[PDB]
RNA sequence: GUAGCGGGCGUGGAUCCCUGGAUGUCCGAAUGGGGGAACCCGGCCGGCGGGAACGCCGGUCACCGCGCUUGCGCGGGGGGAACCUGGGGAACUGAAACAUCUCAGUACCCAGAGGAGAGGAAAGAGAAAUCGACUCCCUGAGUAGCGGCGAGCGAAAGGGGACCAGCCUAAACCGUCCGGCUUGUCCGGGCGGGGUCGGGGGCCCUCGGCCGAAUCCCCAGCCUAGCCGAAGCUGUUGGGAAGCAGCGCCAGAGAGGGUGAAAGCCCCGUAGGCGAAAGGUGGGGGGAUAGGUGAGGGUACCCGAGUACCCCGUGGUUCGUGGAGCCAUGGGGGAAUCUGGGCGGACCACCGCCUAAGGCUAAGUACUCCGGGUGACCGAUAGCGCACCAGUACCGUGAGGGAAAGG
RNA sequence: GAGGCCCGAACCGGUGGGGGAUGCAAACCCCUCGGAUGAGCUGGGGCUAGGAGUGAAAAGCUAACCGAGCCCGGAGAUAGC
RNA sequence: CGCGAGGGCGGCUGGAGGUAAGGGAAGUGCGAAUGCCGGCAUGAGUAACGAUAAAGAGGGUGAGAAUCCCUCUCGCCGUAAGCCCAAGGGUUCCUACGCAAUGGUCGUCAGCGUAGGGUUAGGCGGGACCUAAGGUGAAGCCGAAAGGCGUAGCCGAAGGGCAGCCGGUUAAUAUUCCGGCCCUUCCCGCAGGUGCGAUGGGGGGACGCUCUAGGCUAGGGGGACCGGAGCCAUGGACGAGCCCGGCCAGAAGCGCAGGGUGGGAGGUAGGCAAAUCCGCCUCCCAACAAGCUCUGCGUGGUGGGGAAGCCCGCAACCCCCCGAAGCCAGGGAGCCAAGAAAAGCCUCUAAGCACAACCUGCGGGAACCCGUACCGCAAACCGACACAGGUGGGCGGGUGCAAGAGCACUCAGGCGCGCGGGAGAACCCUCGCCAAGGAACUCUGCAAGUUGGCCCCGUAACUUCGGGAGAAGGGGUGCUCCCUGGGGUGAUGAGCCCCGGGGAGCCGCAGUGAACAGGCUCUGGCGACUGUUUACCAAAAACACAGCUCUCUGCGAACUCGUAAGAGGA
C-alpha cells in the first residue's frame, strides 16, 4: 500500500509540453491524493520534488447506460531544478 | 452475459459445483466529533518519508441496562413478506333520515416477541353420585341470550378429534456474612438450607422403601456437491426422420425435455441403488447429570396487602342499566391466615366447588420473504406493475405515481 | 435642509383601452396609468400546516381550480340516479 | 347440409400442431357504456413556422447550400441585445471526424452523433477560525407509546476575522502555470531581551437613519505640447492640417491628506476580593495640540505594456480641466423609531513554571482538504418547447438637452431574432393625413387628439393657515458679432472650466426646429390623508390608519398556543 498512489503517466500534448521543465502529471489515487504524494513519487523515480498540484475528472458515455471512468484526481510534480529524468524522451 | 482483438491456463488434473477460512474502501443501528448518507475534522499509543512542523499507516475512543471500589465483564440499539401480543384507535357505510346501536376493537399508529407469538396447571367450570392446565379443528348453535327487543350481534357447558407436561418460588424455621442503631442477645439488607398446598408446610417425639429431565452429551437419520443406471438395425419419401414399411429388443425404466418433423431402446433423464473429508440439523432409539422418593401423634408458628372486601367512575363477556353476578380497575374506605378467603347470575340461608393478591412451561396452532412439487391456471391488451437491463423510463418539490417493449 | 412632501428613471405595481383567445404566454404584448426615504423594494439563512397556519380581511394565500391542500390507506364508501 | 346460430366441400396461404363419438367444466359469444388500450382516418396540403432590428452581392468548401466559411456593403442594440460575479445547470468547453434523428425550412452547420483532449492556488472562495436567527442536544422537566420542551456543549453565513498586485502564456485554465516586485502562518537553530503563563477578569471588536466638510483616486474631456507610418481625393486646403497613440504595477524611505488617543502620582465597600488590569473617587501639570500609533494617496530602485500605418509585420509615454455614490472612515452635524453576537486582537493576574515559557532579530526549513471547463437577463437556470414571460450583485464610454442611470445618435463589444420568394384584392392588426363642421358619437368624449422642457411675468374663491399653485392666462427660446460683472485651479496675469448681464444683426412656415415632454376649469357624492386588497374578471365609497370610547387585567396579570412541561404576553 505504498505505490498504489501513482497510477499511470498522463499523455496529452499538454502533458508532454510539461517535460520542458516542471515534470508532467500522472493519474494519482482519487483520495489519499494528499498533495503529500511527493514523498511518494520521489521514492519511486528517485528525485527531489519541489511542488505539487492536483485536479479531478471523468465524463459520461452512451448506449444502454452512461457514467465513465471515475473522477481520477491527477497532477504534475515539479521535480528539482534539472534532475527531470526518465520517461522524458520516452513517447516524445 | 462472446463479438473483437491482446495475451494466457489446463489429465504435472484447470475451469466449474459443495464446505470452511481469508481479504473485505466508504455510508447505513453507525457507535471519536461533525454532517446537507456515502464527505469533513480530531484525542491517546505505535510505525513509516530526510521528518520538527506536513502527510499518510495500524489500534483504539457512542450512549443505555444489568452484576465486582472505580476499572471493569456480560447485554442492548437496526432490519424482516405475512403471521403474533400489547398500548392507542376512526369514518364512510347499515339502521332505506339519525343521535343509542352498526361498521368494529376493523383501518391505521406505536411498542414488543420469534420461528412462531399467545395461552397454560384451577380462588376454574356448572348441576352432572360430575369434569379436571392450555391451545387448535368438528359439533353444540344461529341454540342460549343481547338489542331505539330496530337494524343487527351472538356465546358457554357438554360430545367428538389433534396434541399431551408438568413445574419453581414468597412466608414459618436454622445457619452465615455485612451496615446501622437508643451498645438491647434487636432491627432489616444479601446469600445457603428448608418449603410449595385442597389442604399443605414449620417446629417437636414415633415407624424409612426410587422414578426422571423441557438441560448436557454420543451415534443413527436427514440437509448442504455428486455417481451408477436396461434395450435398434435396415430400407424409404423428405430440406431435415424420431414418420412410413420390415424384422427386433429393454422394462422395478412406456414421467418429461431435447435432437432439422410424431423416438421406451439417439442425448439428458426416468424406475431402482449407491455417496461426504467438511458444516449444519438431529431423543426418532439409546447413555449421563439436575431434581424428585414414606406413614401417625401434639402446639394451635407460615401460607403472597394498600390486596381481598364495600362504595363511586368504567372496560371485557351474548349482557346496550337490566333482577346484573363474575373477570378486569382510576378514586375513596380498608381486613383476615384455615373458627381463614373467593365462586355456583341481586340478597339471605342451606348444599357443593376452588384456594386470589409471585414466576416458568414443550406440543398440537398461524403465516409464506425463502426451496421443491403439482394444476378440467394465464399464455404477452393475459399472467405479477415488470417473460425484455422495471419499481426502470417518464411524472411529481415531496410523500408518491408509474409505462411500453417477447418469437 | 425637515417630510408615510412633489415631478420623474431604476425598482415595485397593475388604472383605462386595443391586441392576444388551438396564445409568445395555463394571465402575455403595446400604449396609458399608481408608488418611488417608506406602513419601501430586494438577496441569502431561518420559523408557522390542513378545521391547522398566515391573513392592512377577499373566505384571500398555503407548489398553475382551496367555504377546508396534496399523497396513500378504510375503498370495490354509498348512489331509491 | 341446417328454419337459424352454425356445420361440411373445394381452391390459394400457412408450416406444427390438432383433437371424434359420448360426456364433464367454465374468466364462454360485444355495436353502442362521452367505455379502456392500440392503429389509422376527417378537417388539410388548410392554420401555423414564436416578436416588423433588414437585408444584398462576390468568392470558398461541397453529392447537394437563400440557410456553412470568408470578404465588401446595409441595418439593430450600446444604464444593452456589451463586459464581470452569484445561483442553478452538469461537459453544454476545445479539437477531428460526421448528418439518420434533434433544429418548426435547409443544412456541408450546431449547444446534435462518435472519439480525444481540457479545469493546476499557503495569499481567490470555502474547511483544520468566530458567532446570528434557528437547529441539535449530555443534564433537567413533561408526555399512553411515538414523542414535546431544554442548560451546557455543538451546528449554523452572503455577517466578523485572515496574507497578491502587474504582465505573459494555451485550441481549451489562470490572482492557480511563468516573470517581476510584495506578503502569511506553523517548525528548528542562533543572538539579544522580559515574570512567563487561560476556555477565567477587563478593554476592544461595536454598528441606526438623513444631511454633510477637506483632501484624494477611479473615471472622463482637452492640448497650440511628444512620437508617429503615412493621406491631399471631388472645387479649395502643402495647413500651428488630417490621422493614430500619448499609460500600468511597484517595497523600505520620503513627502500630503486623514482616523485613533490626554500624561501623572496615590488611594479603593466592585468586576462572584486572585490582578500592579478595568471601574470608581483625590490633586501637580496638559488642554480649540504635540507626541505617539494606524490607514489612504502621491513618489518611489525597478519591471511591464506600448496604434494607426502598405509589403506582409514600425517603438513615445508630458501639461492643464472636470471629477465621484469609491477612499482616508471608527470624519462631522441633526433627528427619534434609539440602532447583533462571538472569535481573532491587547492587557491582568490563577493554578503551575521559571534548565520552562514568552518578545524582537536573522538564517534553514514546513505549508494539507474542497471549488476552479462552459452557460449565466438566457437556446445551457425556472417556465413540457431553441416558449415575445420570470431571475440577485458589480462595470456600464462619447456628444447634445437645465439635470440625470432620461431621450437621440454612436465607441468597445455584440447582434439582423433557424423558412423563404412574389404579388400589391376584400378584411384584420399597427401607423400617418384629411375639406367644412366640431361631441352632433356614445351608457360615457371610451379612444384619439390638443398641452407638453427650462427662464420671466402673472395668478381667485376657500383654507386646518402648510396649502389650494404647474391655479388660471401669457411672453421668451435658434445663429452671428460687440462690451461687461463675479466664481473654482493656477499664481494674484495666461490658458482651463463655472454661473450671469447688457446692445446690435442674420435666416426660415416653424429655434425645447428631431426624441424624452401636463390639456384646463366650475360644481356634487364617498372616503380625511400616504397606504392595503380579491396571484388568474372586482383596487373601491371595502381593509388599514393616527384618534375617541367601553371593557378585562395587581403580575405566577388578563389573553393565546400546548394533554403536559412550557412558551408568547414581557
mmCIF file of C-alpha atoms in Angstrom, chain A residues 7-91:
data_model
loop_
_atom_site.group_PDB
_atom_site.id
_atom_site.type_symbol
_atom_site.label_atom_id
_atom_site.label_comp_id
_atom_site.label_asym_id
_atom_site.label_seq_id
_atom_site.Cartn_x
_atom_site.Cartn_y
_atom_site.Cartn_z
ATOM 1 C CA UNK A 7 -1.117 5.111 -11.284
ATOM 2 C CA UNK A 8 -0.258 5.936 -14.873
ATOM 3 C CA UNK A 9 1.595 8.691 -16.653
ATOM 4 C CA UNK A 10 -0.851 11.042 -18.364
ATOM 5 C CA UNK A 11 -0.409 11.508 -22.113
ATOM 6 C CA UNK A 12 -1.646 14.677 -23.842
ATOM 7 C CA UNK A 13 0.122 17.390 -25.780
ATOM 8 C CA UNK A 14 -0.282 19.452 -22.616
ATOM 9 C CA UNK A 15 1.126 16.547 -20.667
ATOM 10 C CA UNK A 16 4.348 16.349 -22.685
ATOM 11 C CA UNK A 17 4.677 20.097 -23.088
ATOM 12 C CA UNK A 18 5.350 19.995 -19.366
ATOM 13 C CA UNK A 19 8.517 17.981 -19.643
ATOM 14 C CA UNK A 20 10.370 21.119 -20.707
ATOM 15 C CA UNK A 21 10.770 21.868 -17.006
ATOM 16 C CA UNK A 22 8.322 21.017 -14.229
ATOM 17 C CA UNK A 23 7.582 17.356 -14.796
ATOM 18 C CA UNK A 24 4.314 16.039 -16.079
ATOM 19 C CA UNK A 25 1.446 14.591 -14.198
ATOM 20 C CA UNK A 26 0.451 11.036 -13.590
ATOM 21 C CA UNK A 27 -3.013 9.905 -12.694
ATOM 22 C CA UNK A 28 -2.870 9.581 -8.919
ATOM 23 C CA UNK A 29 -5.301 7.992 -6.483
ATOM 24 C CA UNK A 30 -8.658 9.742 -6.150
ATOM 25 C CA UNK A 31 -8.338 10.129 -2.408
ATOM 26 C CA UNK A 32 -5.220 9.802 -0.279
ATOM 27 C CA UNK A 33 -4.364 12.093 -3.135
ATOM 28 C CA UNK A 34 -2.851 14.296 -0.415
ATOM 29 C CA UNK A 35 -0.607 16.732 -2.271
ATOM 30 C CA UNK A 36 1.856 14.993 0.077
ATOM 31 C CA UNK A 37 2.260 12.440 -2.744
ATOM 32 C CA UNK A 38 5.675 13.975 -3.033
ATOM 33 C CA UNK A 39 7.443 11.636 -0.660
ATOM 34 C CA UNK A 40 5.575 9.217 -2.894
ATOM 35 C CA UNK A 41 6.868 9.879 -6.402
ATOM 36 C CA UNK A 42 10.367 10.713 -5.215
ATOM 37 C CA UNK A 43 10.554 7.282 -3.644
ATOM 38 C CA UNK A 44 9.713 5.728 -6.992
ATOM 39 C CA UNK A 45 11.550 7.795 -9.550
ATOM 40 C CA UNK A 46 14.220 8.826 -7.054
ATOM 41 C CA UNK A 47 14.268 12.633 -7.185
ATOM 42 C CA UNK A 48 13.550 15.851 -5.373
ATOM 43 C CA UNK A 49 10.001 17.129 -5.876
ATOM 44 C CA UNK A 50 9.697 20.866 -5.213
ATOM 45 C CA UNK A 51 5.988 21.486 -5.878
ATOM 46 C CA UNK A 52 2.747 19.604 -6.474
ATOM 47 C CA UNK A 53 -0.659 20.334 -7.969
ATOM 48 C CA UNK A 54 -3.890 18.293 -8.276
ATOM 49 C CA UNK A 55 -7.218 18.012 -10.218
ATOM 50 C CA UNK A 56 -10.268 15.715 -10.900
ATOM 51 C CA UNK A 57 -12.331 14.493 -13.965
ATOM 52 C CA UNK A 58 -14.224 11.680 -15.894
ATOM 53 C CA UNK A 59 -17.271 12.121 -18.099
ATOM 54 C CA UNK A 60 -20.140 10.058 -19.441
ATOM 55 C CA UNK A 61 -20.551 7.711 -22.376
ATOM 56 C CA UNK A 62 -23.594 6.325 -24.155
ATOM 57 C CA UNK A 63 -25.501 3.186 -25.043
ATOM 58 C CA UNK A 64 -27.882 1.458 -22.686
ATOM 59 C CA UNK A 65 -26.340 3.485 -19.859
ATOM 60 C CA UNK A 66 -23.729 6.194 -19.064
ATOM 61 C CA UNK A 67 -21.025 7.203 -16.441
ATOM 62 C CA UNK A 68 -17.316 6.935 -17.345
ATOM 63 C CA UNK A 69 -14.079 6.255 -15.505
ATOM 64 C CA UNK A 70 -14.082 7.641 -12.026
ATOM 65 C CA UNK A 71 -13.159 11.183 -11.228
ATOM 66 C CA UNK A 72 -9.434 10.499 -11.127
ATOM 67 C CA UNK A 73 -7.565 13.063 -9.169
ATOM 68 C CA UNK A 74 -4.345 13.759 -11.010
ATOM 69 C CA UNK A 75 -1.422 16.066 -11.276
ATOM 70 C CA UNK A 76 2.098 17.092 -12.005
ATOM 71 C CA UNK A 77 5.062 17.011 -9.632
ATOM 72 C CA UNK A 78 7.593 19.759 -10.400
ATOM 73 C CA UNK A 79 10.797 17.863 -9.548
ATOM 74 C CA UNK A 80 14.036 19.589 -8.598
ATOM 75 C CA UNK A 81 15.906 22.011 -10.838
ATOM 76 C CA UNK A 82 17.306 19.889 -13.718
ATOM 77 C CA UNK A 83 17.003 16.288 -12.344
ATOM 78 C CA UNK A 84 13.986 15.942 -14.605
ATOM 79 C CA UNK A 85 14.545 12.366 -15.682
ATOM 80 C CA UNK A 86 13.216 9.049 -17.004
ATOM 81 C CA UNK A 87 10.228 8.724 -19.328
ATOM 82 C CA UNK A 88 11.069 12.154 -20.694
ATOM 83 C CA UNK A 89 12.325 11.378 -24.202
ATOM 84 C CA UNK A 90 10.077 8.302 -23.952
ATOM 85 C CA UNK A 91 6.987 8.670 -26.189
#
